[PDB]
Design a protein around this ligand. Sequence first.
Ligand SMILES: CCOC(=O)c1[nH]c(C)c2c1CCCC2=O
Length: 109
Amino acid sequence: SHMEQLKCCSGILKEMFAKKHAAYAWPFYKPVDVEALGLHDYCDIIKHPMDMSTIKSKLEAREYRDAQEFGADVRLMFSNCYKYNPPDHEVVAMARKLQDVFEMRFAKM
Ligand SMILES: CCOC(=O)c1[nH]c(C)c2c1CCCC2=O
């Protein structure tokens, strides 16, 4: 059931937003503020920005046909972070910790 697997996707996103993961998930909660100092080049590098609130809205608006499409947006959000930032940036390590949560849940769904 595609409906049931999308309910699992909503459960994975709910955990990613949970207090347990907040110490490293918070940079991914909302769209990157491209007007902040140091982010003048974000829009030139990142063609398709993505964040957890936009994914939550896409789930609510039924913009994902299946778990594969939901997973693609979660992975786009982490890939944007890895592409934009230097490999030693604090946010890259936070993205890895959050991706560990996602990949384990997504694989076992
Ligand atoms: C202080 C507020 O910065 C953020 O929440 C935030 N989130 C992500 C994913 C990023 C940033 C800033 C650096 C670029 C980046 O990849």
